[PDB]
From a paper:
To compare mechanisms of anti-CBASS and anti-Pycsar evasion, we determined the crystal structure of Apyc1 from the phage Bsp38 (2.7 Å) as well as structures of Paenibacillus Apyc1 proteins (1.5 Å and 1.8 Å). Structures of Apyc1 reveal a metal-dependent cyclic NMP phosphodiesterase that uses relaxed specificity to target Pycsar cyclic pyrimidine mononucleotide signals. Structural comparison of Apyc1 and B. subtilis YhfI also reveals that Apyc1 enzymes contain an extended loop that reaches into the nucleotide-binding pocket, potentially enabling stable binding of smaller cyclic pyrimidine substrates. Recombinant protein produced from gene 147 rapidly degrades the Pycsar signals cCMP and cUMP, and we named this anti-Pycsar protein Apyc1 (European Nucleotide Archive genome accession number ERS1981056). SBSphiJ Apyc1 efficiently hydrolyses a wide range of cyclic mononucleotides, exhibiting an atypically relaxed nucleobase specificity that enables targeting of cyclic pyrimidine signals used in Pycsar immunity. By contrast, the closely related B. subtilis enzymes YhfI (GenBank accession number NP_388905.1) and MBL phosphodiesterase (GenBank accession number WP_013351727.1) exhibited a strong preference for cAMP/cGMP over cCMP/cUMP cleavage, confirming that relaxed nucleotide specificity and Pycsar signal degradation are unique to Apyc1 and not general features of MBL phosphodiesterase enzymes.
The cyclic oligonucleotide-based antiphage signalling system (CBASS) and the pyrimidine cyclase system for antiphage resistance (Pycsar) are antiphage defence systems in diverse bacteria that use cyclic nucleotide signals to induce cell death and prevent viral propagation. Here we show that phages encode anti-CBASS (Acb) and anti-Pycsar (Apyc) proteins that counteract defence by specifically degrading cyclic nucleotide signals that activate host immunity. Using a biochemical screen of 57 phages in Escherichia coli and Bacillus subtilis, we discover Acb1 from phage T4 and Apyc1 from phage SBSphiJ as founding members of distinct families of immune evasion proteins. We confirmed the critical role for Apyc1 metal-coordinating residues and identified E74 and Y112 from the opposing protomer as further catalytic residues required for cCMP hydrolysis and release of the reaction product 5′-CMP. Together, these findings demonstrate that Acb1 and Apyc1 constitute separate families of immune evasion proteins and explain the distinct reaction mechanisms that degrade CBASS or Pycsar cyclic nucleotide signals.
Numbering used by the authors:
A (entry chain A), B (entry chain A): 6 to 116, 120 to 179, 181 to 189, 193 to 238, 244 to 255
Write the structure that this text describes.
């Protein structure tokens, strides 16, 4: 079980791609978390063919995480002979994904629903706590509803491979009640206080406890020229 | 009056940016045609600061031409002290731009309408022919409704500087009835017959007339390793 950060920058970064995770499990299952407009290019830069993708997980209904979904359905239905793959989407983000964010239909293959391009795996969610959803024989996913922008639902995902909790992926603002009960933690990081992201200073305000060895930062601004926490390096495996 | 192609690739290209034109007129007016998700990065690569942008023209309500509009409003309202600039939008693409394509509101500066981030210049259009709309003392724009995808309106733009027709920008499928009554013509080009783009072979089917000196190709696929018509070179001025 190893992870590869396809992109690491924020929504408006120009040096790094859209923050997306490329997780490959012990049973050969390759999972991608979020697929923005520049994520398929980040996959083409990392020299991983898109034919190896088995499932895609979605935590946003915004451009930087769903931008490349139309391109993925383009590649699968046209070149790959309509290979319908997994689109792991939480239940509350299903109707908001197709009818709204994808204009109720794709551009090049106009009208059809989302079930024609992907095998929609509606994951279970609610608002007062976490939620577990099994996928394969040893692929489990814990979903935590994170607060990003008002009147919109974002989610954090945890991954369990054959029982053991492997990595906690936040995909979120500075949430006071964390769980890091996980081996590794990748957390959204910002360089300016306020807004709709967890800032670096807010992370250092909750840091004297030596859990810093586990924390990894991501989803940051473009001016990057940079305490025990190590940033997620784009193009670095495991 | 010179043009600079910021990006030249199609929606799914990875080597070139989103097809966008950077036009600077004789009166110092700098105009950008279409602003997709990778266009602000294409501006950062071309070493043109975004503070010099005077107006933005929109011919699509799709991701590859409106993706970067939220980033432009981000830069202007936050860093530039709320410098409201020109957003040249045809009349029929106004209500479809804000309520639908921009989720009825931006992410980082949540609720407000489009008039708070830009000075909406509603351009005049109709479906049976071209339409002229004056902007400044010597900035005129001719809008031709092009057919892209069904049940959606796209537009081609022509630019007249102090009277003379300078360039015809198609931004479209293979339209049989063209006007090239213009000095220069930039046309969408595709490498595969069918779809919703004008293909290269369809252009060569309408080519024995020696008007090829005027035609320039753009908005093409990524496999580019390539009759008198010359392709638009990314990063080439005038
Ligand atoms: Zn993100
Ligand atoms: Zn987010
Ligand atoms: Zn285009
Ligand atoms: Zn188009």
């Amino acid at each position: 079980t190893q992870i590869r950060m396809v992109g690491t920058g924020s929504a408006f970064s120009k040096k790094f791609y859209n923050n997306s995770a490329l997780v490959t499990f012990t049973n050969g299952y390759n999972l991608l978390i979020d697929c923005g407009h520049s994520v398929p290019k980040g996959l083409h830069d990392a020299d991983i063919p898109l034919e190896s993708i088995d499932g895609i997980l979605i935590t946003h209904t915004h451009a930087d995480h769903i931008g490349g979904l139309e391109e993925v359905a383009l590649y699968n239905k046209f070149v790959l002979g309509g290979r319908k793959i997994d689109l792991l989407v939480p239940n509350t983000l299903v109707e908001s994904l197709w009818e709204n964010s994808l204009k109720g239909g794709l551009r090049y293959s106009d009208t059809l629903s989302l079930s024609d391009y992907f095998t929609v795996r509606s994951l279970k969610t609610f608002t007062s706590g976490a939620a577990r959803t099994q996928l394969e024989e040893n692929i489990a996913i814990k979903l935590y509803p994170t607060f990003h922008v008002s009147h919109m639902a974002s989610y954090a995902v945890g991954l369990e491979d054959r029982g053991e909790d492997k990595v906690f992926y936040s995909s979120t603002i500075f949430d006071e009640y964390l769980i890091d009960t996980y081996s590794w933690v990748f957390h959204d990081c910002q360089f300016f206080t306020g807004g709709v992201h967890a800032s670096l200073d807010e992370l250092l305000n909750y840091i004297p406890e030596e859990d810093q060895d586990r924390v990894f930062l991501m989803h940051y601004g473009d001016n990057m020229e940079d305490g025990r926490m190590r940033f997620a390096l784009q193009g670095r495996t495991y």
